[PDB]
Design a protein around this nucleic acid. Structure first.
Ligand SMILES: CN[C@@H]1[C@@H](O)[C@@H](O[C@@H]2[C@@H](O)[C@H](O[C@H]3O[C@H]([C@@H](C)O)[C@@H](O)[C@H](O)[C@H]3N)[C@@H](N)C[C@H]2N)OC[C@]1(C)O
Lengths: 60, 159, 185, 51, 171, 230
RNA sequence: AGCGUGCUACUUAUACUUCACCGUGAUUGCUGUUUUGACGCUUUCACGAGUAGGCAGGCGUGGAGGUCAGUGACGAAGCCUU
RNA sequence: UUGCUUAAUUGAACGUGGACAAUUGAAUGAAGAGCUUUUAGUGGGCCAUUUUUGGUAAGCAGAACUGGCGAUGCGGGAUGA
RNA sequence: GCCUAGACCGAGGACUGCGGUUUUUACCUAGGAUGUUGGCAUAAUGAUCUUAAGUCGCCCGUCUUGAAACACGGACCAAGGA
């Protein structure tokens, strides 16, 4: 009495291609989330030291 | 009812190759992966730890993280009208360097060498690849090669 | 028939005139439309499009942001240009002598500029004394500091502000926000 | 305001292609070709007739 | 006018192992050169294991009738496909060119066997030089002594709708 | 005052154009000599191919012509009921209406492109006169995203002069002999908007030319079709 | 005037080509002549199917502020009328 | 540069300074690209070729890709989503 | 290269451009039709109404995958009506 259509993927790719399918956008610096914590911890100190060394070198 | 478990439908994809069962040859564990390498994902059925999902079997991605026994690979997956950045942790038994990249680096080296040669020689070299062109003209001799006539053959039965 | 590669009859989607009905704003638009049409100085085209902007797209510019703009290397003598309102900032310890061109000055901002020997001038005066926008510096206010912007893109793990009328312990701090109440998204 | 076919309008033809005057005046379209009467197929190529 | 006879000569593309590939010729009855080269590649792909992509056409040439105003009897050997199988057959035609006899053969197998052009392979067309090489009586009866015959019941084709005189069929 | 100013302004125009015409007279010499040089090399190319064929017959050899480098592709199918991949291919060839025609340089990449669109196009190898007739009658240039008639050599030179294309005959030469800047010249040409053929098509179009239809490669008969449609 | 096949011409869709006109979108230029319209004028090109639905520009009705020192018993409003 | 790593002056990641400039490293195209807010209707579908399941089968029931009808007139199939 | 038979159209509105003939700051077929002649203005000419002929045209609204439906509401008109 209420038997109806169960499932179909008809028209679904047509809908997806109206405004997609968009590639995700890339950046020069990726987020360091999910990167190994030990590496990320030391990478903080390396970037900090580089900034100080460059600031000192620019000073003299 | 229906069954949609984690490894459903992987009966053949996760089987080992014929007469290729048993221990992993150690070259798998001696390869070195760096962040930014391009790797192919292939599940090894004998290593149940750090496996890909069946979706990532046969996909290729970028290494973004390196741990004790595994790498993190970035994959783009289509979900509806856009891609989603996926991050998968894979033990190195399920990963392999991609060969096309090493070929492309070969081309970069060769191209720099040629441009340096032309620079130091006083000429200019064109370095874009080109698709196959139509062939040019040519003259064919008949010395020992008189054209031989062929005809369609009659029908025959071999029962 | 045509196999259209793009959508037909699409308006550009950029505002080509102020929605404002102010006659004096339209006088300024007339001036800078002439200037952008006859001068090929990029400053005039930028000023022309800026006059079209809506109120939220012209955030107020504080005098402290102006003074930080004037501390750039070589910018102490520039004419600061604001297409919008310049507001006063009492957190500012000191303000220098400067020329500022703006649509509007609040009373405190104008008093502060004039007391330090500066010049608070309008955009037609700027056009008369810098028809190409020579030695100008355009300063824009913070667009994303609006309170409405806190609630844009709200969703699980997005870390945005919920749309809520009261704030307190009983208002949306339970299930869904706390692992002790089920889950936390 | 009106596109004129150079293949039909002579003035537009000469406006676009000045060499059209030299082509016409030199009768390039009906130019004779000097050469000798030859029959280069009389040998093996006559295998067009039978193999 | 439907068909012409062509020769088509081709070979494999030269390679390091085989710098001088053999040249192969075919005699093709086709409406134009595009169809002629297509037929050549069709037959070369069926006989030898060569594809179009690895070969090249060397020459395409009209083969004209030697004696276009000499009455001839031709024997034609055919392989054709019916609705139910594949058959060989031999028929005879009278014409002044090979192309004329081939066009007649195509019409004839269309008429009597419902055999379309795509279903027929022309094995061989031979000019029958002797009266003893002519086998079929439907052409043999036109090779007899002092042949003559009337054309009874001539129907004249009129240029008007209405005729003021009674019809006649004398001739 | 108005009458004297216009007479004063007209004589300014007349004096100014007396100088431009001198400066234009030198440039018209350049394009004249180029077209004279192109005509010479076309005839020299034709006679040399004839000579090489005749020499091959004598020396018991076969001369194989250089494979065609150029095709002209006409869309002869309407815009309804096209599968996605040939539809995209036809869009990438700028063939977005029935009876639109473009020039395509032949390589492996473009050959596979045209392979995809085969049951919707008619194409072949255009002759020199066909190219000239198409460019002269239905030649339009893409100037600032606008279809502009190629009615003056100034229009051609202001848009392709940086590629050493200064005249309509330079453009025709660059198309016919597939030159270094075939890409820019062919993309500058708006897709040709042809009529239906005078005399119609064959009884049924949408099957290959080989099987008696109208689609695919017809290899010298594209010129007869274009004469029907141009 | 049936069936198989080849050919020549011919017929005609809101399709294609050229031209006219309407609209939409873009586009050229316009202040010592910008001059009482610059929300205007002007050069050029492309495009036009549509339910549900969205938006835009307009037409019409009762009443209100302002204006036309507006119409009207020499006929307002209403109504009938190739 | 680093607090990570190496027996190590080994590496890892990110850099300073110097070299390579329009063939910046395949084709074709590109009424341009990117970003944001907000809200309508809808959430019964059906048909055709091919693949395909249950069923003797069905103008039957159920999936896959595509194109359509629904939402669409027009020329043709006499008539017909 | 030349000769030759018909049809449809005439947008724009001082000049400005590109070319051509050079006889020359002139002329041209070269940035869109002009010349000339007859008739009529008590009229041919155009527009609408009625009707005849040719051709095409099922009853709207609605729910629906699908309506002209042997699915539902609607005899007609005015005023009210979300
Ligand atoms: C080589 N495999 C073929 C596969 O190519 C395909 O063949 C189609 C064939 O089915 C189509 O034919 C189909 O569609 C036509 C019509 C509606 O187009 C019908 O007349 C026909 O009955 C129907 N079988 C035919 N027109 C093209 C082939 N490539 O489908 C059949 C197949 C056996 O799987």
């Amino acid at each position: 009495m209420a038997k109806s259509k169960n499932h179909t993927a008809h028209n679904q790719t047509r809908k997806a291609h109206r405004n997609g399918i968009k590639k995700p956008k890339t950046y020069k610096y990726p987020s360091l989330k999910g990167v190994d914590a030990k590496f990320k911890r030391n990478h903080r100190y390396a970037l900090h030291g580089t900034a100080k060394a460059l600031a000192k070198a620019r000073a003299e | 009812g229906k069954s949609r478990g984690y490894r459903s439908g992987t009966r053949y994809a996760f089987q080992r190759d014929f007469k290729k069962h048993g221990a992993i040859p150690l070259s798998t564990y001696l390869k070195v992966y760096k962040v930014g390498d391009i790797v192919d994902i292939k599940a090894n059925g004998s290593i149940q730890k750090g496996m890909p999902h069946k979706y990532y079997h046969g996909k290729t991605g970028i290494v973004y993280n390196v741990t004790k026994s595994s790498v993190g690979v970035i994959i783009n997956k289509v979900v509806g009208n856009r891609y989603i950045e996926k991050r998968v942790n894979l033990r190195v038994e399920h990963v392999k360097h991609s060969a096309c990249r090493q070929e492309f680096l070969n081309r970069v080296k060769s191209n720099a060498a040629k441009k340096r040669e032309a620079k130091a020689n006083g000429e200019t070299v064109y370095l874009k690849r080109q698709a196959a062109k139509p062939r040019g003209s040519r003259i064919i001799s008949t010395e020992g090669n008189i054209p031989q006539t062929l005809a369609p053959v009659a029908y025959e039965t071999f029962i | 028939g045509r196999d259209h590669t793009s959508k037909q009859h699409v308006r550009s989607g950029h505002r080509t005139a102020p929605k404002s009905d102010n006659v004096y704003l339209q006088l300024l638009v007339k001036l800078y439309s002439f200037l952008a049409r006859r001068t090929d100085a990029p400053f005039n085209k930028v000023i022309l499009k800026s006059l079209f902007l809506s109120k939220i797209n012209r955030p107020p510019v504080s005098v402290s942001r102006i003074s930080r703009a004037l501390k750039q290397k070589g910018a102490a003598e520039k004419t600061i240009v604001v297409v919008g309102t310049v507001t006063d900032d009492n957190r500012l310890l000191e303000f220098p002598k400067a020329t500022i061109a703006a649509l509007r000055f609040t009373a405190g901002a104008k008093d502060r500029i004039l007391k330090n020997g500066g010049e608070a001038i309008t955009l037609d005066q700027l056009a008369l004394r810098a028809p190409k926008g020579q030695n100008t510096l355009i300063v824009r206010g913070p667009r994303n500091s609006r309170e409405a912007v806190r609630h844009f893109g709200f969703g699980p793990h997005k870390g945005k502000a919920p749309r809520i009328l009261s704030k307190g312990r009983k208002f949306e701090r339970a299930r869904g926000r706390r692992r002790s109440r089920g889950f936390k998204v | 305001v009106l596109k004129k076919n150079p293949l039909k309008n002579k003035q537009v033809l000469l406006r676009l292609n000045p060499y059209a005057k030299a082509y016409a005046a030199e009768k390039v379209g009906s130019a004779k070709v000097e050469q000798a009467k030859v029959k280069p197929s009389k040998g093996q190529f006559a295998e067009v007739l039978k193999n | 006018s439907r068909l012409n006879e062509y020769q088509v000569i081709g070979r494999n593309l030269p390679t390091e192992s085989v710098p001088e590939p053999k040249l192969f010729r075919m005699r093709i009855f086709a409406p134009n050169t595009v169809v002629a080269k297509s037929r050549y590649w069709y037959f070369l792909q069926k006989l030898h294991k060569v594809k179009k992509a690895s070969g090249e056409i060397v020459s395409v040439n009209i083969i004209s009738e030697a004696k276009p105003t000499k009455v001839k009897t031709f024997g034609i050997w055919l392989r054709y496909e019916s609705r139910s199988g594949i058959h060989n057959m031999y028929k005879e035609y009278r014409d002044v060119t090979r192309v004329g006899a081939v066009e007649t053969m195509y019409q004839d197998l269309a008429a009597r066997h419902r055999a379309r052009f795509r279903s027929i392979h022309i094995l061989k067309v031979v000019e029958l030089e002797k009266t003893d090489d002519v086998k079929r009586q439907y052409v043999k009866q036109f090779l007899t002594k002092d042949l003559k015959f009337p054309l009874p019941h001539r129907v004249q084709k009129s240029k008007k709708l209405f005729q003021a005189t009674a019809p006649t069929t004398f001739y | 005052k108005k009458e004297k100013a216009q007479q004063k302004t007209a004589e300014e125009r007349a004096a100014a154009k007396k100088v431009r015409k001198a400066a234009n007279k030198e440039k018209r010499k350049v394009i004249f000599d180029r077209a004279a040089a192109y005509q010479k090399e076309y005839t020299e190319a034709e006679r040399s191919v004839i000579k090489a064929k005749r020499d091959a017959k004598a020396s018991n050899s076969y001369y194989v012509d250089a494979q065609p480098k150029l095709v002209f592709v006409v869309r002869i199918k309407g815009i309804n009921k096209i599968p996605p991949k040939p539809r995209k291919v036809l869009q990438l060839l700028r063939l977005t209406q029935i009876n639109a025609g473009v020039f395509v340089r032949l390589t492996k990449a473009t050959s596979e492109l045209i392979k995809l669109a085969e049951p919707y196009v008619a194409y072949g190898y255009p002759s020199l006169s066909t190219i000239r007739q198409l460019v002269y009658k239905r030649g339009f240039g893409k100037v600032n995203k606008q279809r502009i008639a190629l009615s003056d050599n100034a229009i051609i030179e202001a848009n392709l002069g940086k590629f050493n294309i200064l005249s309509i005959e330079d453009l025709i030469h660059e198309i016919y002999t597939v030159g270094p800047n075939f890409k820019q010249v062919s993309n500058f040409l708006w897709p040709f908007k042809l009529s239906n053929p005078n005399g119609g098509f064959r009884a049924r179009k949408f099957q290959h030319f080989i099987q008696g239809g109208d689609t695919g490669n017809r290899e010298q008969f594209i010129n007869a079709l274009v004469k029907q449609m141009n």
